[PDB]
Amino acid sequence: TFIQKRTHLFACGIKRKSIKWICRENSEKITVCVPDRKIQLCIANFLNSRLETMEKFKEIFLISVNTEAKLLYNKNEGKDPSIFCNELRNSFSDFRNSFIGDDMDFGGNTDRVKGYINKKFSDYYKEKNVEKLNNIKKEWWEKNKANLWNHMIVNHKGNIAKECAIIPAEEPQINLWIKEWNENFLMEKKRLFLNIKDKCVENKKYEACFGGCRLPCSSYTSFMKKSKTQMEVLTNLYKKKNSGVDKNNFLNDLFKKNNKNDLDDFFKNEKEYDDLCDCRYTATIIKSFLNGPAKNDVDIASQINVNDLRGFGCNYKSNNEKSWNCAGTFTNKFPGTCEPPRRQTLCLGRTYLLHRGHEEDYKEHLLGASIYEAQLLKYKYKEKDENALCSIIQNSYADLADIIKGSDIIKDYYGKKMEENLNKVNKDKKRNEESLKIFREKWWDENKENVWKVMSAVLKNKETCKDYDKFQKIPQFLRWFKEWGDDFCEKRKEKIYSFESFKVECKKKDCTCKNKCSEYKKWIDLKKSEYEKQVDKYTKDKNKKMYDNIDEVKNKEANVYLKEKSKECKDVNFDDKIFNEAPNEYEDMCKKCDE
């Protein structure tokens, strides 16, 4: 009775509502993609009957199709009725094609029922020739299909369009599956893209730079990836089932129906996706520097976009000059170290935001910081020569490497978070110091080339800048010490010249020698202490054999290391006069401030 009707329903069971396609390889090592609708096709009832006679087999078939309809109706409640219509038709076709030996779906009950139905038809006709049986089944379908279809939709004719009640034309399964898949695809494609619009709006307010927009963008991307592999399978199976030919332009026509040329063009992300899903203060510029205008045009690579710059969380290097910092918390573990002003003002952006641990986001952020650092440096020192600009870019490049590797001496608020957020990218559950270090170290090696590529884009004749890799391998402090030398010698030269132009001006007309001399005394004493600190570390560290594997350093007096590595000091000897409260040439002049 009605109770027994429930039995039919539950024999097959409630259907999953989501529309998905599952790809597996069959016994012949051949990959196929089956729709979940086919996986859940209502066939269980065949297994609950002895199928004693052909009348019975017919009766059970009638129950199967009619039940499939009910379950499809419950599945598609709340969905556009066109969907229920198509699934009715497509399931009817699978009943036909899985019955007459044209089925890509395999395993589980699909083969359990198939094999059973074949065995019963062996009994019915007493024929074991599989080919003959298949023909017998084809004839049987011919005579029963009209009644099977009619009964399948008898309770739902009113819920579908008049035209959907017409029995489906007979076609190969793969043709029907491709069509169904195409429809499933375009629907989910629209939906996922509308979410992108909703959350990204027009992406004119850096929406794509935040999770609200990046999530639907990301969902859309993966869906296209999965979809592309799926269509490849289905499209190859078509050719294979037609002597390796696109019989009747089926595949071709289908591509033109959607205004596309082929698989590739079918999944090529349009301009609109990039416009809505690329964070314009990271992704857009990265693409320019690696693949676009900036790549081969220094002028363009050098031009700064203020809005993007401040969006990312950095600003121009101030015209003011910060002192060297020899008194941070880092002096606890590394006494004698002096942080370069350049390091104190290094652009890292909002590193505290990469807490979700996505490698692509992290890479995108690092390259962003690297680009702006380069541009900002280029802007600050645009009036310097190629060799200097080159070395200045390498300084920050190497510091970045030290920050990512976790060897950076400063461990400031933003550096630390950069390091820790790379640890987050690492999903390995072994999380001791050395284990995490090794990961970061390997990660930098895999990315350090691109980092240099984008930073080197702001230099004339990029290949002029060499051994950036070797330079990065040099202990940070040693790199800084030399940086300090060049900075010291330079500013000393400047201050000497300042005295001259001042002396010559006074030498003619009107004349505070004491006041300028005073300012210099303060400066030189400050630099003297900085020098002493770093010399002490260089010496103490050297004695601990920390520089054994470093040529052009082993057993070289600190002040010698400077005169060599520091070009700017080539003409200076670190005497005991060098740090005099006044230059030896202006010693007497700074004295006798009576004139």
Side-chain angles (χ1 to χ4, degrees):
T1 79
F2 143 74
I3 277 59
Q4 197 174 5
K5 287 194 293 174
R6 296 288 289 178
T7 304
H8 299 333
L9 277 162
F10 286 109
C12 294
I14 308 113
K15 296 178 178 297
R16 296 180 280 274
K17 280 173 147 287
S18 298
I19 301 173
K20 60 193 282 185
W21 287 73
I22 302 131
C23 300
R24 307 179 296 265
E25 70 172 14
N26 65 28
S27 59
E28 307 177 31
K29 303 168 182 173
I30 298 296
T31 293
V32 292
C33 294
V34 183
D36 205 26
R37 179 197 46 75
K38 174 61 170 67
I39 289 169
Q40 294 201 289
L41 191 71
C42 181
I43 63 180
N45 294 288
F46 284 115
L47 295 166
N48 298 327
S49 176
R50 299 174 181 80
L51 303 178
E52 315 89 17
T53 66
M54 298 230 224
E55 298 189 28
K56 195 61 174 178
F57 172 81
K58 172 60 175 293
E59 177 196 339
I60 298 301
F61 218 141
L62 285 166
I63 290 171
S64 296
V65 299
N66 178 270
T67 300
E68 172 70 9
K70 288 190 189 182
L71 292 173
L72 284 177
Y73 178 85
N74 294 344
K75 178 188 173 191
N76 291 290
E77 268 189 2
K79 297 196 188 189
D80 192 89
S82 76
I83 292 170
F84 173 56
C85 168
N86 295 339
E87 296 189 8
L88 274 174
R89 303 172 68 79
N90 289 343
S91 273
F92 178 76
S93 301
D94 279 328
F95 278 122
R96 174 183 179 266
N97 287 338
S98 61
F99 180 65
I100 66 178
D102 179 26
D103 195 351
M104 289 165 286
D105 177 31
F106 73 98
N109 280 2
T110 292
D111 289 347
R112 205 166 274 141
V113 175
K114 171 210 165 181
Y116 186 50
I117 286 173
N118 286 340
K119 184 266 173 175
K120 294 312 304 182
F121 266 81
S122 273
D123 301 336
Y124 297 157
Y125 292 78
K126 299 180 185 305
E127 175 65 0
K128 297 173 184 175
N129 196 288
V130 179
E131 177 60 19
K132 300 297 182 180
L133 272 184
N134 203 75
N135 285 334
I136 287 174
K137 291 189 291 178
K138 291 170 82 152
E139 296 181 43
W140 183 95
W141 186 261
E142 248 296 295
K143 287 145 185 177
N144 290 276
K145 64 183 177 172
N147 175 229
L148 286 170
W149 169 248
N150 284 337
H151 180 70
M152 178 175 189
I153 66 174
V154 68
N155 300 125
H156 303 90
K157 289 186 71 177
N159 308 100
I160 62 184
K162 171 186 177 183
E163 22 283 329
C164 191
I166 304 302
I167 189 170
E170 296 171 354
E171 309 184 42
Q173 179 178 67
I174 193 168
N175 299 32
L176 296 175
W177 279 15
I178 284 180
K179 279 153 147 182
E180 180 183 7
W181 181 96
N182 184 32
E183 290 172 327
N184 297 155
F185 171 74
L186 295 175
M187 184 167 63
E188 178 63 3
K189 179 155 138 62
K190 286 183 187 180
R191 190 188 71 80
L192 288 173
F193 202 81
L194 288 182
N195 286 330
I196 287 174
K197 295 218 195 193
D198 183 51
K199 303 314 184 76
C200 307
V201 189
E202 297 192 306
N203 194 29
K204 290 169 177 176
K205 296 175 172 178
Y206 297 126
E207 285 94 333
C209 308
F210 305 100
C213 172
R214 297 182 72 78
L215 293 185
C217 289
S218 172
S219 294
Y220 182 87
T221 290
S222 59
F223 160 80
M224 297 293 285
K225 290 179 179 176
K226 291 186 172 61
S227 297
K228 174 170 181 174
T229 68
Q230 282 180 355
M231 204 184 72
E232 285 173 11
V233 165
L234 295 174
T235 217
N236 297 340
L237 289 172
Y238 183 76
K239 290 167 178 168
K240 173 171 182 176
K241 287 172 171 287
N242 288 275
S243 311
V245 174
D246 190 356
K247 183 71 176 182
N248 299 8
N249 305 279
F250 182 68
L251 299 174
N252 175 253
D253 295 328
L254 168 135
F255 285 140
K256 183 180 176 184
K257 287 177 187 177
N258 307 127
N259 311 330
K260 302 298 170 191
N261 305 327
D262 49 32
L263 294 109
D264 186 20
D265 183 35
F266 199 82
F267 299 106
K268 284 200 190 75
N269 276 11
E270 297 168 4
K271 223 279 179 60
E272 192 175 8
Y273 175 92
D274 284 9
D275 294 337
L276 291 183
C277 290
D278 283 9
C279 171
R280 285 170 187 174
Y281 67 50
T282 29
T284 300
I285 304 188
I286 291 170
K287 286 186 183 182
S288 181
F289 274 66
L290 288 180
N291 301 276
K295 183 186 177 181
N296 310 289
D297 188 327
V298 174
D299 299 329
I300 300 174
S302 295
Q303 187 167 331
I304 298 181
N305 181 312
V306 174
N307 294 335
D308 292 349
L309 173 64
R310 293 174 178 174
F312 187 82
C314 295
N315 197 39
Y316 293 96
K317 311 300 178 178
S318 68
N319 303 335
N320 297 324
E321 42 80 25
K322 285 200 175 184
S323 295
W324 284 70
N325 175 17
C326 310
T329 48
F330 62 86
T331 68
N332 297 129
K333 184 201 262 187
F334 302 103
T337 296
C338 288
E339 187 180 8
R342 179 196 49 73
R343 171 63 182 87
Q344 299 174 38
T345 67
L346 177 69
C347 170
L348 297 176
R350 310 166 199 282
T351 58
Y352 56 88
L353 289 176
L354 293 314
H355 65 268
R356 302 201 169 191
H358 297 293
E359 195 189 317
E360 290 307 320
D361 288 343
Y362 187 91
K363 182 185 179 181
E364 183 173 334
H365 180 101
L366 176 57
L367 297 170
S370 297
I371 286 170
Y372 294 119
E373 177 64 8
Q375 285 179 322
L376 293 173
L377 287 173
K378 175 57 177 293
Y379 181 79
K380 180 61 184 297
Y381 304 100
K382 61 192 186 300
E383 288 192 350
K384 283 190 172 293
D385 65 54
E386 275 181 347
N387 300 339
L389 248 174
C390 172
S391 55
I392 291 176
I393 290 296
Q394 283 191 7
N395 286 338
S396 287
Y397 170 66
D399 280 341
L400 288 168
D402 270 311
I403 285 172
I404 297 303
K405 287 175 60 172
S407 60
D408 173 69
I409 291 175
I410 307 302
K411 301 299 195 180
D412 70 317
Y413 182 89
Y414 296 98
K416 264 241 207 180
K417 288 198 173 303
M418 196 59 187
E419 177 186 347
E420 295 172 338
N421 281 334
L422 180 49
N423 290 345
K424 289 187 181 183
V425 170
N426 182 5
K427 304 303 178 183
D428 193 282
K429 287 181 172 57
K430 203 201 190 180
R431 312 200 64 74
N432 53 280
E433 279 196 64
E434 180 161 45
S435 182
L436 296 178
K437 187 194 67 156
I438 295 165
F439 174 90
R440 294 193 310 271
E441 287 182 352
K442 289 179 177 179
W443 191 91
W444 172 255
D445 284 342
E446 297 166 4
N447 289 276
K448 64 179 182 181
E449 294 177 352
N450 279 328
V451 171
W452 176 250
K453 274 180 176 178
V454 301
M455 292 188 75
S456 62
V458 305
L459 301 167
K460 300 178 182 177
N461 300 279
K462 308 201 302 175
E463 293 189 5
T464 298
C465 205
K466 327 162 188 171
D467 294 321
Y468 51 82
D469 190 30
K470 268 184 176 181
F471 185 65
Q472 176 253 321
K473 293 201 179 78
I474 293 179
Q476 188 172 46
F477 165 72
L478 291 174
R479 305 194 316 263
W480 289 357
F481 190 14
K482 136 170 152 52
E483 188 182 353
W484 176 97
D486 288 336
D487 179 69
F488 167 72
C489 296
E490 178 180 6
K491 302 314 175 185
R492 181 179 165 87
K493 270 211 303 295
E494 182 177 357
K495 276 161 165 53
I496 286 182
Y497 298 170
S498 302
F499 276 114
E500 286 176 303
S501 58
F502 171 95
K503 182 176 180 175
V504 179
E505 185 101 281
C506 287
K507 209 164 193 173
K508 284 273 172 174
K509 291 211 161 184
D510 286 21
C511 72
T512 62
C513 80
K514 186 212 73 67
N515 205 10
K516 286 285 172 287
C517 278
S518 175
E519 295 176 30
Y520 184 84
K521 293 171 181 178
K522 294 290 181 62
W523 182 77
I524 197 63
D525 291 343
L526 174 61
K527 305 302 289 182
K528 179 181 174 62
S529 55
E530 295 173 358
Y531 171 87
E532 288 176 343
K533 283 184 175 67
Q534 294 169 104
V535 158
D536 190 42
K537 173 177 170 62
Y538 174 96
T539 302
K540 287 177 174 171
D541 284 351
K542 182 183 68 178
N543 293 329
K544 289 150 63 186
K545 302 182 181 181
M546 300 168 69
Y547 308 149
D548 262 28
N549 306 279
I550 302 180
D551 300 36
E552 281 180 354
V553 170
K554 183 197 174 191
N555 191 21
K556 290 189 176 185
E557 231 63 279
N559 56 11
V560 167
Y561 166 88
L562 284 182
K563 246 237 68 180
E564 290 188 348
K565 290 289 185 174
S566 298
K567 270 193 202 174
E568 206 77 352
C569 311
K570 175 189 173 186
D571 357 82
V572 179
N573 290 332
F574 293 86
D575 312 338
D576 211 89
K577 298 178 176 179
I578 192 67
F579 293 116
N580 282 343
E581 282 165 352
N584 193 30
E585 58 259 81
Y586 285 97
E587 194 71 0
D588 180 42
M589 312 317 297
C590 273
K591 299 165 179 173
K592 304 276 264 58
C593 284
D594 317 337
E595 300 177 343

Short mmCIF file of all heavy atoms in Angstrom, two decimals, residues 447-471:
data_model
loop_
_atom_site.label_atom_id
_atom_site.label_comp_id
_atom_site.label_asym_id
_atom_site.label_seq_id
_atom_site.Cartn_x
_atom_site.Cartn_y
_atom_site.Cartn_z
N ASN A 447 61.87 31.91 -3.92
CA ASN A 447 61.26 33.18 -4.31
C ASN A 447 62.23 34.36 -4.43
O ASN A 447 61.86 35.42 -4.93
CB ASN A 447 60.15 33.55 -3.31
CG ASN A 447 58.93 32.65 -3.44
OD1 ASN A 447 58.06 32.89 -4.28
ND2 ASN A 447 58.86 31.62 -2.61
N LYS A 448 63.47 34.17 -3.99
CA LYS A 448 64.42 35.27 -3.92
C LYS A 448 64.75 35.86 -5.30
O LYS A 448 65.16 37.01 -5.41
CB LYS A 448 65.71 34.81 -3.24
CG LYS A 448 66.46 33.74 -4.01
CD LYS A 448 67.73 33.34 -3.29
CE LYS A 448 68.50 32.30 -4.08
NZ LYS A 448 69.74 31.89 -3.38
N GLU A 449 64.57 35.05 -6.35
CA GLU A 449 64.86 35.50 -7.70
C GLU A 449 63.82 36.52 -8.19
O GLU A 449 64.18 37.59 -8.68
CB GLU A 449 64.91 34.31 -8.66
CG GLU A 449 66.07 33.36 -8.39
CD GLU A 449 66.06 32.14 -9.30
OE1 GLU A 449 65.07 31.96 -10.04
OE2 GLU A 449 67.05 31.37 -9.27
N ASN A 450 62.55 36.18 -8.05
CA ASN A 450 61.48 37.11 -8.40
C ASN A 450 61.56 38.40 -7.58
O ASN A 450 61.28 39.48 -8.09
CB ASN A 450 60.11 36.46 -8.21
CG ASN A 450 59.73 35.57 -9.38
OD1 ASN A 450 60.10 35.84 -10.52
ND2 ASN A 450 58.97 34.52 -9.10
N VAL A 451 61.93 38.28 -6.32
CA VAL A 451 62.05 39.45 -5.46
C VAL A 451 63.08 40.40 -6.06
O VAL A 451 62.86 41.60 -6.16
CB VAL A 451 62.46 39.08 -4.03
CG1 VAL A 451 62.79 40.33 -3.22
CG2 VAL A 451 61.35 38.28 -3.35
N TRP A 452 64.22 39.85 -6.48
CA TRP A 452 65.26 40.67 -7.08
C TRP A 452 64.81 41.23 -8.43
O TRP A 452 65.16 42.36 -8.79
CB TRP A 452 66.56 39.89 -7.26
CG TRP A 452 67.58 40.72 -7.95
CD1 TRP A 452 68.06 40.55 -9.22
CD2 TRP A 452 68.22 41.89 -7.43
NE1 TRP A 452 68.97 41.53 -9.51
CE2 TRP A 452 69.09 42.37 -8.43
CE3 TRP A 452 68.15 42.57 -6.21
CZ2 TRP A 452 69.89 43.49 -8.24
CZ3 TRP A 452 68.94 43.69 -6.03
CH2 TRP A 452 69.80 44.14 -7.04
N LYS A 453 64.05 40.44 -9.18
CA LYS A 453 63.55 40.88 -10.48
C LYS A 453 62.75 42.17 -10.37
O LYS A 453 62.97 43.11 -11.14
CB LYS A 453 62.69 39.79 -11.12
CG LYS A 453 63.47 38.75 -11.91
CD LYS A 453 62.56 37.70 -12.53
CE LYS A 453 63.35 36.73 -13.39
NZ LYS A 453 62.49 35.67 -13.97
N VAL A 454 61.83 42.22 -9.41
CA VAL A 454 60.96 43.39 -9.28
C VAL A 454 61.70 44.59 -8.71
O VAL A 454 61.42 45.73 -9.07
CB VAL A 454 59.69 43.09 -8.43
CG1 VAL A 454 58.89 41.96 -9.05
CG2 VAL A 454 60.05 42.77 -7.00
N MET A 455 62.66 44.34 -7.82
CA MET A 455 63.42 45.42 -7.21
C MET A 455 64.43 46.00 -8.19
O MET A 455 64.71 47.20 -8.17
CB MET A 455 64.15 44.95 -5.96
CG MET A 455 63.24 44.57 -4.80
SD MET A 455 64.16 44.24 -3.29
CE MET A 455 64.60 45.90 -2.78
N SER A 456 64.96 45.15 -9.07
CA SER A 456 65.97 45.57 -10.02
C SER A 456 65.37 46.35 -11.18
O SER A 456 66.09 46.90 -12.01
CB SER A 456 66.73 44.35 -10.55
OG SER A 456 65.86 43.47 -11.25
N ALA A 457 64.04 46.39 -11.23
CA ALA A 457 63.34 47.04 -12.33
C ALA A 457 63.50 48.56 -12.31
O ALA A 457 63.28 49.22 -13.32
CB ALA A 457 61.87 46.68 -12.29
N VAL A 458 63.89 49.11 -11.16
CA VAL A 458 64.03 50.55 -11.04
C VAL A 458 65.44 51.05 -11.38
O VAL A 458 65.73 52.24 -11.26
CB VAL A 458 63.67 51.03 -9.62
CG1 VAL A 458 62.28 50.56 -9.24
CG2 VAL A 458 64.71 50.54 -8.61
N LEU A 459 66.30 50.14 -11.82
CA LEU A 459 67.68 50.49 -12.14
C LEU A 459 67.94 50.54 -13.65
O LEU A 459 67.46 49.69 -14.40
CB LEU A 459 68.64 49.47 -11.52
CG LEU A 459 68.58 49.32 -10.00
CD1 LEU A 459 69.33 48.07 -9.57
CD2 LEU A 459 69.15 50.55 -9.31
N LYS A 460 68.70 51.54 -14.08
CA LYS A 460 69.19 51.57 -15.45
C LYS A 460 70.18 50.43 -15.62
O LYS A 460 70.92 50.10 -14.69
CB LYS A 460 69.89 52.90 -15.75
CG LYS A 460 69.02 54.13 -15.59
CD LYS A 460 69.82 55.40 -15.85
CE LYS A 460 68.99 56.66 -15.65
NZ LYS A 460 69.80 57.89 -15.84
N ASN A 461 70.20 49.82 -16.80
CA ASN A 461 71.07 48.67 -17.04
C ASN A 461 71.06 47.72 -15.85
O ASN A 461 71.98 47.73 -15.03
CB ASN A 461 72.50 49.13 -17.32
CG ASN A 461 72.60 50.04 -18.54
OD1 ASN A 461 72.64 49.57 -19.68
ND2 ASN A 461 72.65 51.35 -18.30
N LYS A 462 70.02 46.91 -15.75
CA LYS A 462 69.82 46.04 -14.60
C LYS A 462 71.00 45.09 -14.39
O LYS A 462 71.43 44.86 -13.26
CB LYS A 462 68.53 45.24 -14.75
CG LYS A 462 67.30 46.09 -15.05
CD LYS A 462 66.00 45.36 -14.70
CE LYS A 462 65.87 44.05 -15.45
NZ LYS A 462 64.65 43.30 -15.02
N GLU A 463 71.53 44.55 -15.48
CA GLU A 463 72.63 43.59 -15.40
C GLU A 463 73.93 44.22 -14.91
O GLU A 463 74.93 43.53 -14.71
CB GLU A 463 72.85 42.91 -16.76
CG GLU A 463 71.70 42.02 -17.19
CD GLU A 463 72.03 41.20 -18.42
OE1 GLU A 463 73.19 41.25 -18.89
OE2 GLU A 463 71.14 40.49 -18.93
N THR A 464 73.92 45.54 -14.73
CA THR A 464 75.04 46.23 -14.10
C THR A 464 75.13 45.81 -12.64
O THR A 464 76.21 45.81 -12.05
CB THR A 464 74.86 47.76 -14.17
OG1 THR A 464 74.82 48.18 -15.54
CG2 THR A 464 76.00 48.47 -13.45
N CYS A 465 73.99 45.45 -12.07
CA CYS A 465 73.90 45.09 -10.66
C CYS A 465 74.06 43.58 -10.48
O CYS A 465 73.20 42.80 -10.86
CB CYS A 465 72.55 45.54 -10.11
SG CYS A 465 72.53 45.81 -8.35
N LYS A 466 75.18 43.18 -9.87
CA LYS A 466 75.58 41.78 -9.85
C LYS A 466 75.75 41.23 -8.44
O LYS A 466 75.87 41.99 -7.48
CB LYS A 466 76.91 41.62 -10.60
CG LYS A 466 77.10 42.58 -11.76
CD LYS A 466 78.57 42.68 -12.16
CE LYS A 466 78.80 43.77 -13.18
NZ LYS A 466 80.24 44.02 -13.42
N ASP A 467 75.77 39.91 -8.34
CA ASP A 467 76.09 39.22 -7.09
C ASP A 467 75.16 39.63 -5.95
O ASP A 467 75.54 39.57 -4.78
CB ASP A 467 77.55 39.48 -6.70
CG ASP A 467 78.53 38.85 -7.69
OD1 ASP A 467 78.26 37.73 -8.16
OD2 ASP A 467 79.56 39.49 -7.99
N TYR A 468 73.95 40.02 -6.30
CA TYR A 468 72.94 40.33 -5.30
C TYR A 468 72.71 39.11 -4.42
O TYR A 468 72.38 39.23 -3.24
CB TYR A 468 71.63 40.77 -5.96
CG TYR A 468 71.13 39.82 -7.03
CD1 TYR A 468 70.42 38.68 -6.70
CD2 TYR A 468 71.37 40.07 -8.38
CE1 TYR A 468 69.96 37.81 -7.67
CE2 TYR A 468 70.91 39.21 -9.36
CZ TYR A 468 70.21 38.08 -8.99
OH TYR A 468 69.75 37.22 -9.96
N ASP A 469 72.89 37.92 -4.99
CA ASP A 469 72.68 36.68 -4.26
C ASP A 469 73.80 36.44 -3.25
O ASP A 469 73.54 36.13 -2.09
CB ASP A 469 72.59 35.50 -5.22
CG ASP A 469 72.15 34.23 -4.53
OD1 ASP A 469 71.40 34.32 -3.53
OD2 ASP A 469 72.54 33.13 -4.98
N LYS A 470 75.05 36.59 -3.69
CA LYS A 470 76.19 36.46 -2.79
C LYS A 470 76.12 37.49 -1.67
O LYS A 470 76.41 37.19 -0.52
CB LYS A 470 77.51 36.63 -3.55
CG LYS A 470 78.12 35.33 -4.07
CD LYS A 470 79.47 35.58 -4.72
CE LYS A 470 80.14 34.28 -5.14
NZ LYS A 470 81.47 34.52 -5.76
N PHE A 471 75.73 38.71 -2.03
CA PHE A 471 75.64 39.79 -1.06
C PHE A 471 74.65 39.44 0.05
O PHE A 471 74.91 39.70 1.23
CB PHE A 471 75.22 41.08 -1.75
CG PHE A 471 75.22 42.28 -0.84
CD1 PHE A 471 76.40 42.74 -0.28
CD2 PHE A 471 74.04 42.93 -0.54
CE1 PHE A 471 76.40 43.84 0.55
CE2 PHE A 471 74.03 44.03 0.30
CZ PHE A 471 75.21 44.49 0.84
#
